[PDB]
Amino acid sequence: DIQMTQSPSSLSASVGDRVTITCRASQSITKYLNWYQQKPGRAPKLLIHTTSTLQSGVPSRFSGSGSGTDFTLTISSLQLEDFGTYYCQQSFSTLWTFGQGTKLDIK
Amino acid sequence: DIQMTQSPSSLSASVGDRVTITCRASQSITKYLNWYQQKPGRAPKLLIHTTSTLQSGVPSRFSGSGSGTDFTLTISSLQLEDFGTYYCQQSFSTLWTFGQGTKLDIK
Amino acid sequence: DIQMTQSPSSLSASVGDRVTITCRASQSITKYLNWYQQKPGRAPKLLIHTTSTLQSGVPSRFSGSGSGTDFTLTISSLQLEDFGTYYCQQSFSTLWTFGQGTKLDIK
Amino acid sequence: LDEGIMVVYKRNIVAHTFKVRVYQKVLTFRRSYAYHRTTYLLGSNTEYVAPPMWEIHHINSHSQCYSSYSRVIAGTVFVAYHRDSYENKTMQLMPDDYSNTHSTRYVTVKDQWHSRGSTNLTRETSNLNCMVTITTARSKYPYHFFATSTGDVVDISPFYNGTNRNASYFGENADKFFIFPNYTIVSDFGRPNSALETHRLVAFLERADSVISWDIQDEKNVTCQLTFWEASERTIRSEAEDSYHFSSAKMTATFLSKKQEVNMSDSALDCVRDEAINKLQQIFNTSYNQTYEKYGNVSVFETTGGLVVFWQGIKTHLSNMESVHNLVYAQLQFTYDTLRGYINRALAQIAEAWCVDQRRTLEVFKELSKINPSAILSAIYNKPIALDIDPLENTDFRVLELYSQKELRSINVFDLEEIMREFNSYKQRVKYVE
Amino acid sequence: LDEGIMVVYKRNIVAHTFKVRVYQKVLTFRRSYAYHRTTYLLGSNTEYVAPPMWEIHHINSHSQCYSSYSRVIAGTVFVAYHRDSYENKTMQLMPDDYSNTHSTRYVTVKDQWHSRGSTNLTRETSNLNCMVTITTARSKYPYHFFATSTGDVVDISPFYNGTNRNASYFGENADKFFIFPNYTIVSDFGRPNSALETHRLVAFLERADSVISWDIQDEKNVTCQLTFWEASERTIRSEAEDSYHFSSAKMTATFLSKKQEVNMSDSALDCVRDEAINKLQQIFNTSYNQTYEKYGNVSVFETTGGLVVFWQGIKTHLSNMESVHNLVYAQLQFTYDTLRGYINRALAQIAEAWCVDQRRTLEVFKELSKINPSAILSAIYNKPIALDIDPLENTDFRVLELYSQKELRSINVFDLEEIMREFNSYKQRVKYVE
Amino acid sequence: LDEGIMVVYKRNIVAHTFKVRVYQKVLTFRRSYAYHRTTYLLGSNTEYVAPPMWEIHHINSHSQCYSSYSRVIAGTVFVAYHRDSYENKTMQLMPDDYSNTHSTRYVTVKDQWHSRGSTNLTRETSNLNCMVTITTARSKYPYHFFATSTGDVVDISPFYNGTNRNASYFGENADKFFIFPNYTIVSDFGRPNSALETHRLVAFLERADSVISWDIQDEKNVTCQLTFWEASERTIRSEAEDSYHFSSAKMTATFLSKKQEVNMSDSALDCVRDEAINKLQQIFNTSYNQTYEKYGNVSVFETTGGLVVFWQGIKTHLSNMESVHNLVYAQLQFTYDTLRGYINRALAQIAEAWCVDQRRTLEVFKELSKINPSAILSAIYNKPIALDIDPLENTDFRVLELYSQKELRSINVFDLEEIMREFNSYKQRVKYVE
Amino acid sequence: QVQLVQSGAEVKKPGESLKISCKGSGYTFTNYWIGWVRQMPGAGLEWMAIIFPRDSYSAYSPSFQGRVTISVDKSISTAYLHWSSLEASDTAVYYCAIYNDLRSGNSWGQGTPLIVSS
Amino acid sequence: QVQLVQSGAEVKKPGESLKISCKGSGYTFTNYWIGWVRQMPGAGLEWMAIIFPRDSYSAYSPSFQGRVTISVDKSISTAYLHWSSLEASDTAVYYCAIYNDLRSGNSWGQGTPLIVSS
Amino acid sequence: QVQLVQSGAEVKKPGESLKISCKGSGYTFTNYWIGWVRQMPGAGLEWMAIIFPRDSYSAYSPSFQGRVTISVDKSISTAYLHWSSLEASDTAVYYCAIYNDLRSGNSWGQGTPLIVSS
Ligand SMILES: *[C@@H]1O[C@H](CO)[C@@H](O[C@@H]2O[C@H](CO)[C@@H](O)[C@H](O)[C@H]2NC(C)=O)[C@H](O)[C@H]1NC(C)=O
Ligand SMILES: *[C@@H]1O[C@H](CO)[C@@H](O)[C@H](O)[C@H]1NC(C)=O
Ligand SMILES: *[C@@H]1O[C@H](CO)[C@@H](O)[C@H](O)[C@H]1NC(C)=O
Ligand SMILES: *[C@@H]1O[C@H](CO)[C@@H](O)[C@H](O)[C@H]1NC(C)=O
């Protein structure tokens, strides 16, 4: 078994603010470490893959980086539709481990 | 020591009859298994070699085949001069084993 | 340690006489076995090297040969300036062993 | 005198190049002897073996191989584990850097491993490595065999797919050859879980030392035997007792073809049939529009030099002969057909002037004979009764060899004879020195 | 203007090819380690050694070798038995199938053999194999060395037989070279007791890894240096200040030879001397009989391009220069000697017409000066007192490279530079990875 | 019509050849098994390793190496001694005889050594040999890599010396590459205490299997890219709408260059700049002195065929295009520019004669119309009112292939395809036979 | 890259069996592995079945032994999820996805909400 | 392929020595092994000597030790059979043959009948 | 081949230190090993120091430990012989030479006679 922690658990920010979300795990190797996007009542959708390529149709306002056992997803400017639930996960061969997922919202 | 049996010991047939004569031995390998031809008061002469080639000067009325430890010589049509003593033998390097030889004659 | 003997210790000859001087040692291999030339009050100077090549500026009146543990230097015609002290030596890497040197003079 | 647009296609002498996946297990056994604190290396032996077919499928599906190899010899299974580790570890294919031009390799092991043995005892350790090489394999017509950049030669046509036995050569054993439809292969071998591309037909061959895999493509789709050389819109066409002559001043050369036309429905012109037409149409829409019209249909001719000509005038099978590398002979025809078309025409511009002139003088004599018959008598006698020198000397051409044979043998940095002599010297040093 | 029948012989640039029997003992030692029920293969090493001379004689006499090999090292005899069987079994040479173009091999062992060792103990087993290869060896003039299809190079002339030292090169050690007269060799190595063909002289060389045997043939009997290119009965012969010109319209080319004739008794023309004559006689009995007779004797000429011409008119030693592969330059002479023979003759047909014409007009003026001196005064003044344009422009030829250098480097499926780079990469992978 | 002395330099297609010192330690481990009185050879394995840098310095200083080799693997030092002798003996480099063309080798050990082991026990003995090979390494422009006669390929420019990174290629690892100024190397490796020559800069590279050393030379000093082909003092110069034409009757060829001159200060002409001038001056002092003077300065032109022309009349950068091996096309221009310069001039000698003649007749008619208008009326009507045949036929040239493709593939005694097929067969025999 | 359309919302009481169809839209594939998961409010997605594209084996070691059966097929790859002995804890949204189409792209299906209500 | 002619019939009483000449006709050979055999009425041929072409060693392990001596020679290969201590059991037809000339061709000689009669 | 000029004659009493200069004439060298020797009447030359060209270590195992110090340098290779505690037995002619320039050529210097006299 391996651990997975996506931080922060809950956070809020205004429109047009760069925000960084971290993901930590006890994986032996880098694996893939993709980042997703979900909304309440909607199916999850990917955001980034391999920490170097992004899903087609998603503009370049999202970026990803990583070092050691930590991997960060950065957003240059938050939009109205960007608030939701985000997930980080590992997937190798058929084995798959998912993350709890951070929540982004505006008061 | 090895055994050698040429069959039949004695047989008779009319003019123009296909006849098959068998030769059996306990040889380790195929060796050569040539077939000869002899007449009373005459020197022996070869008929077939390697079960695939025939002596020059002998027409194509003789054929040879073999399987396992048995080797057969077949004659399509017997002629007046074809009656006589036939032999089968093995010869490797300088070692040579000869056969008793079948007798073909017409009453 | 190795031995070295240059023969003769002292000898005399007239002008224009071929003279052979020998050098013996307990060297493991051929090494180089060069031959020198010295005069009283003058610095030593080479005569032959490798038993096959001679110092530049020295004419072809000197020759060298060798066999086994013996090496001979031969002079065709002795001259007035050829009288002096001669040496044979071995030199490998930085190690060097020198000879006592024969004396050539005319009464 | 008639004119037409021509497209000269040269024979595809360049070998068809495709990508071949070579899967190989490198068993590198290093043996050493340990004595107190100093270890004596006893040597090493490296061999290449073909991974099993299921392992090939696992590699093509996950970019991962297994650290164990199994071989059946005389009914006995011999198993070799990587770094003498008796587990079933699955190792990923990572790049080994290097350049190798076009021979990228993915290996599970990037560093040789060997541990010293116990005191007064020799130890041998295995260094099994799973290597996948994306090599470039080149084949030449009739494509009965293709060879990669490395030393791998197979007697199998790249387009043979089981049902193409009569049209594609297959000389290797059928047991070692397999065909897989809708086969899935990783897009990138360097990382696991890569995108899996599906291919309609993939061929595998279990070689002696490796497994060679290639994607099967149609021969008439990607391996067409004609390459576009050049198009000429201003070409003069002429007919001679045994040849059609197409002379282009753009390239200053004339091509001679036999007195026959190649059928347009030939199987060797398929991928060219449209293409050679299309460019022609483009030309007809680029330089000779409005004022010119297409005279006749598109025709195919085979020149004596081996080139193919697609001809369309504007106002019956191909052979195996290859095109001549040096086209100066064609230019030679341009040096002849021009002058032959000039000097003769010059004669047609001189004799026509001369014959009239001799006529014009003749009438002058015709009346003169009635008045002064002496001139006529002298003309018919060519004797009395009662311009420039020619510098065209014999310019005997000599053999202008720009580079001598010694220079020609040293054009490239690799000489096969020297390499073979060095290999022979190596064999002598390892055997004859004994 | 004189005519004669010519036979053009080209230089024999093709290497003389003969059959070489390579006898080699393949010692393939397979080492493995057995643990409980799983056996770990520790590796294998394959080496090639030269069988002893008596074993070579036994093979050539009976198509059979021995399952034991002996080698002397430092005064100690090392003996290796096949499949660790310590008997003196004699094994027959059976074919190993395969194709190998022209490299048929007969081997006593067709399957690799190896048995697993005891528990907790490594075992190494030998796989000695007697292999006889009927390879094709090619040699080029002066035949100082010949090499087979495989990687075997020997510094011995194929025709040297001991007494031919001054005429045939011999650079290898004389200890390893042997000559046998009236030597008996099996006709077929595939089966025992085959027909024993007797040869007048057979040469053997004990190489480092094998033994190379070849049947010695006379250099002037089977290795003639001239190859029949073509013949021409309708050839125009001309003489120029430094060269004889032989122009043939059948091949549309002219060859230029020096102002000397090669002696008919030359040693390099022997096998050709009769043959080149015979064809000539055949031609004299085929196309130009009855009405024509042989003018002069048969002569030999060496053209500037390297070709040899046997000439016989119908009504002094050779050099080492080789023939030019591309003969377009000869055709260039046919483009010149024709036009030079035409235009000048055209001048001989124009100036001769002009000089008479200027004469014919002159007499017309000669009397006219007595009647109308104005015309004569104007002619001698070339001024009054009281045809066609030239389309022959500067057609500067460009370099019509049909195939670019990139295309030329990819003509063949094998590139030497790529193979050497792959070998270097293999060396790096087996050594640098450490 | 203007004349000048020309010097044609051809492109240096021959690879620059230099001497490379390859230092290698050959570890040849021979393993055998001894049983009673008969010893069974278990095999052998030969590997090549790079000697340490300090040992390279010792060899270059004393022509002597050490009988011990050390290698670091996974933090453990493995040491191999020669003939299992655990001392630190220093062995001298003695020649191994042989010829190897230009691959002289100096080895400390000239005979393979192996002693039989004890009864019922296998023994393996090392045969470490220090081999220094003075190989010939050839490099081609842009000299990004050079390869020796043996199978050694390095991705380092021969002229790179650390500070020449931007002008000389360097693709190998910088860790394995070293530069030594004022480095001392033995003149003769065959004997100890040889003369120590000092060199300004020596480059070393620790390869996987050996160490490659070479003396660094300036690229513009010893590796000039132009080779003198031929000089011609009697050359006719002409101008055409797009090209300067230089026609030499000594070589019977004309070269066409673009309408521009290469700058004399070009970096690729340096070693030629003086040399090409010097010969010119020599020519000006040899054949065309006193009565002739140098018209204009020396100019550099690049012909369309790739040749370089240094021109000096007597009364703007180079490209990477290489010269054409076959110069017959240039001779083709000599077949054209002559005839184009002849026939047209012939027209200039005929039409000029014709136009005057038609004038001379015209005046004869001019008065005749006053006396006999019938001739004038017939001339203006070209009808009555009240020379030679042309043998210039269509000589369609055929492809005169002197040697067929089968003959062309067998020119040399080595065929790469056959060697690769034999190597594949060897791999099948060592692996597939199992 | 592949849409992987799925059937609409299905309502079924517990106890009996549940059938779900998930068409392999986007492109005809036999390479991308198939993953069936379920999602419930208050938490993320949890894997329930990981299988090959062209066939199925219903790999489930720690979760719901015998309660999941997948068949799928080749070519069009129409996945079929079958559940036996439906329980109240199974009321959730089921998703079908391909493991990776292009560049680690795990495209999920539309999602079928199995919800028990009136 | 090679005739291998042999001398005519020879008559000699027992006790003394017998000399038989067998010329190597057909073609000059030094490759085909030489076999000397004897044949008696009522049975086939029995091998008595097998030797090399260019020389001879009279190989006879189980039959008539010391009673057969063959010399032969090179080139023309004229075989010479010599018998000592002739016995009544030796009255038979002696044959010389080459072991194999072409395609397992063992061509026999004309055969010399050694018969004791009046 | 290289002259290897040396300083002139030097006169110094025993006890103090002796300085000798050996200029590397002929050609700029850093390859030929340097040898310092001494010669006395009635006997030949005896080696005292053998050192590298570009530097020095004063290698002297059996003779005069601590009494010889050589420094030399690179490029011009100007050798510096230094002697401490001069004794009466040291009165002799000192020579500096290169071990081998060309073809085993050991060219000696001019020689400095260290002699104690009035
Ligand atoms: C196996 O037997 C053969 C012959 O039957 C042996 O070959 C002989 O070798 C010796 C030298 O050792 C030669 O003098 C003989 O001429 C060889 N015989 C023949 C017929 O040529 C061979 O040595 C035997 N094997 C071993 C391992 O001793
Ligand atoms: C490949 O196999 C199919 C049958 O599945 C066949 O129709 C086709 O012709 C084959 N390809 C070629 C190039 O023949
Ligand atoms: C071969 O040797 C014989 C002598 O036996 C000699 O006469 C002959 O010239 C030799 N062959 C050649 C090609 O020299
Ligand atoms: C070699 O290095 C020197 C600096 O020491 C540099 O000036 C020179 O340009 C270098 N050689 C080349 C060919 O660049």
Short mmCIF file of N, CA and C in Angstrom, two decimals, chain D residues 256-315:
data_model
loop_
_atom_site.label_atom_id
_atom_site.label_comp_id
_atom_site.label_asym_id
_atom_site.label_seq_id
_atom_site.Cartn_x
_atom_site.Cartn_y
_atom_site.Cartn_z
N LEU D 256 15.39 9.20 -75.83
CA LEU D 256 14.93 8.39 -76.95
C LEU D 256 14.15 7.20 -76.41
N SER D 257 12.93 7.01 -76.93
CA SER D 257 12.07 5.92 -76.51
C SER D 257 11.69 5.08 -77.72
N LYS D 258 11.36 3.82 -77.46
CA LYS D 258 11.01 2.90 -78.53
C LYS D 258 9.69 3.30 -79.18
N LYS D 259 9.44 2.74 -80.36
CA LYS D 259 8.24 3.06 -81.14
C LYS D 259 7.02 2.30 -80.61
N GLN D 260 6.76 2.51 -79.32
CA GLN D 260 5.59 1.92 -78.67
C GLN D 260 5.29 2.73 -77.41
N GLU D 261 4.05 2.63 -76.95
CA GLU D 261 3.59 3.33 -75.76
C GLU D 261 3.22 2.32 -74.68
N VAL D 262 3.64 2.60 -73.45
CA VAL D 262 3.31 1.74 -72.32
C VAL D 262 1.84 1.94 -71.96
N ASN D 263 1.14 0.84 -71.71
CA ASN D 263 -0.27 0.91 -71.36
C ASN D 263 -0.46 1.71 -70.08
N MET D 264 -1.46 2.60 -70.08
CA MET D 264 -1.69 3.46 -68.93
C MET D 264 -2.15 2.67 -67.71
N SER D 265 -2.78 1.52 -67.93
CA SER D 265 -3.29 0.68 -66.85
C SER D 265 -2.24 -0.28 -66.29
N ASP D 266 -0.96 0.00 -66.49
CA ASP D 266 0.09 -0.86 -65.97
C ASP D 266 0.11 -0.81 -64.45
N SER D 267 0.43 -1.95 -63.84
CA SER D 267 0.42 -2.05 -62.38
C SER D 267 1.59 -1.32 -61.74
N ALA D 268 2.65 -1.04 -62.50
CA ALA D 268 3.82 -0.36 -61.94
C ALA D 268 3.68 1.16 -61.94
N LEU D 269 2.63 1.70 -62.55
CA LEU D 269 2.43 3.14 -62.64
C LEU D 269 1.34 3.66 -61.71
N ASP D 270 0.78 2.80 -60.86
CA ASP D 270 -0.43 3.12 -60.11
C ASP D 270 -0.31 4.42 -59.32
N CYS D 271 0.56 4.45 -58.31
CA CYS D 271 0.73 5.66 -57.52
C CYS D 271 1.24 6.82 -58.35
N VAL D 272 1.84 6.55 -59.50
CA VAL D 272 2.30 7.62 -60.37
C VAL D 272 1.19 8.07 -61.30
N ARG D 273 0.27 7.16 -61.65
CA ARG D 273 -0.71 7.42 -62.69
C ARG D 273 -1.48 8.71 -62.43
N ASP D 274 -2.01 8.86 -61.21
CA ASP D 274 -2.64 10.12 -60.85
C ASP D 274 -1.60 11.23 -60.71
N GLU D 275 -0.52 10.96 -59.96
CA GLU D 275 0.43 12.01 -59.61
C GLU D 275 1.05 12.62 -60.86
N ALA D 276 1.59 11.78 -61.74
CA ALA D 276 2.17 12.28 -62.98
C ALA D 276 1.15 13.07 -63.79
N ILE D 277 -0.13 12.69 -63.72
CA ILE D 277 -1.16 13.47 -64.38
C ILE D 277 -1.35 14.81 -63.68
N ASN D 278 -1.42 14.78 -62.35
CA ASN D 278 -1.77 15.98 -61.60
C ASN D 278 -0.81 17.12 -61.90
N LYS D 279 0.50 16.86 -61.76
CA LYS D 279 1.50 17.87 -62.09
C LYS D 279 1.29 18.39 -63.50
N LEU D 280 1.06 17.48 -64.46
CA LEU D 280 0.79 17.88 -65.83
C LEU D 280 -0.35 18.90 -65.86
N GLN D 281 -1.46 18.57 -65.21
CA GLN D 281 -2.59 19.50 -65.16
C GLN D 281 -2.16 20.82 -64.54
N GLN D 282 -1.40 20.76 -63.45
CA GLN D 282 -0.88 21.98 -62.84
C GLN D 282 -0.09 22.79 -63.85
N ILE D 283 0.77 22.12 -64.62
CA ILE D 283 1.54 22.82 -65.65
C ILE D 283 0.59 23.41 -66.69
N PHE D 284 -0.43 22.65 -67.08
CA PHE D 284 -1.39 23.16 -68.05
C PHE D 284 -2.17 24.34 -67.49
N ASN D 285 -2.19 24.49 -66.16
CA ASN D 285 -2.83 25.62 -65.52
C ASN D 285 -1.83 26.66 -65.03
N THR D 286 -0.56 26.56 -65.44
CA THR D 286 0.47 27.47 -64.95
C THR D 286 1.17 28.25 -66.05
N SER D 287 1.50 27.63 -67.17
CA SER D 287 2.32 28.30 -68.17
C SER D 287 1.69 28.35 -69.56
N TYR D 288 0.93 27.33 -69.94
CA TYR D 288 0.41 27.20 -71.30
C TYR D 288 -1.11 27.05 -71.28
N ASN D 289 -1.78 27.94 -70.55
CA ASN D 289 -3.23 27.95 -70.51
C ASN D 289 -3.77 28.78 -71.67
N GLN D 290 -5.08 29.07 -71.64
CA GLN D 290 -5.82 29.82 -72.66
C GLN D 290 -5.37 29.56 -74.09
N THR D 291 -4.17 30.00 -74.46
CA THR D 291 -3.71 29.94 -75.84
C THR D 291 -3.33 28.53 -76.29
N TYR D 292 -3.28 27.55 -75.39
CA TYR D 292 -2.91 26.19 -75.75
C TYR D 292 -3.97 25.22 -75.24
N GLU D 293 -4.06 24.08 -75.92
CA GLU D 293 -5.01 23.03 -75.57
C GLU D 293 -4.29 21.69 -75.56
N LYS D 294 -4.80 20.76 -74.76
CA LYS D 294 -4.20 19.43 -74.64
C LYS D 294 -4.48 18.64 -75.91
N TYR D 295 -3.43 18.21 -76.60
CA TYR D 295 -3.54 17.42 -77.81
C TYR D 295 -3.26 15.96 -77.47
N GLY D 296 -4.30 15.13 -77.47
CA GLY D 296 -4.16 13.73 -77.17
C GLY D 296 -4.19 13.44 -75.68
N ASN D 297 -4.24 12.15 -75.35
CA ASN D 297 -4.28 11.72 -73.97
C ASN D 297 -2.86 11.52 -73.43
N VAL D 298 -2.77 11.35 -72.11
CA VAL D 298 -1.49 11.14 -71.46
C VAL D 298 -0.95 9.76 -71.84
N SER D 299 0.33 9.72 -72.22
CA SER D 299 0.97 8.49 -72.65
C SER D 299 2.21 8.23 -71.80
N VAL D 300 2.60 6.96 -71.73
CA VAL D 300 3.75 6.53 -70.95
C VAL D 300 4.77 5.90 -71.89
N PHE D 301 6.01 6.35 -71.81
CA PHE D 301 7.09 5.82 -72.63
C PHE D 301 8.26 5.42 -71.74
N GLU D 302 8.99 4.40 -72.19
CA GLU D 302 10.20 3.95 -71.51
C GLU D 302 11.39 4.25 -72.41
N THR D 303 12.31 5.07 -71.93
CA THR D 303 13.46 5.47 -72.72
C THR D 303 14.51 4.36 -72.74
N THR D 304 15.40 4.44 -73.72
CA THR D 304 16.49 3.47 -73.82
C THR D 304 17.43 3.55 -72.63
N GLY D 305 17.51 4.70 -71.96
CA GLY D 305 18.34 4.84 -70.78
C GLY D 305 17.72 4.35 -69.49
N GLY D 306 16.46 3.94 -69.52
CA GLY D 306 15.78 3.42 -68.35
C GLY D 306 14.81 4.39 -67.69
N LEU D 307 14.83 5.66 -68.07
CA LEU D 307 13.92 6.64 -67.50
C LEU D 307 12.51 6.43 -68.01
N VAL D 308 11.54 6.91 -67.23
CA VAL D 308 10.12 6.84 -67.59
C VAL D 308 9.65 8.24 -67.94
N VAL D 309 8.88 8.36 -69.02
CA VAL D 309 8.40 9.65 -69.49
C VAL D 309 6.88 9.62 -69.55
N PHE D 310 6.24 10.55 -68.85
CA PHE D 310 4.81 10.78 -68.99
C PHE D 310 4.63 11.99 -69.90
N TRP D 311 4.03 11.76 -71.07
CA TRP D 311 3.97 12.74 -72.14
C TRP D 311 2.54 13.17 -72.39
N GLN D 312 2.33 14.47 -72.58
CA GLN D 312 1.03 15.02 -72.94
C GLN D 312 1.24 16.08 -74.01
N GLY D 313 0.92 15.75 -75.26
CA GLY D 313 1.06 16.72 -76.33
C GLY D 313 0.12 17.90 -76.15
N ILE D 314 0.60 19.07 -76.58
CA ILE D 314 -0.15 20.31 -76.37
C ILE D 314 -0.04 21.14 -77.64
N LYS D 315 -1.17 21.73 -78.04
CA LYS D 315 -1.21 22.57 -79.24
C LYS D 315 -2.03 23.83 -78.98
#
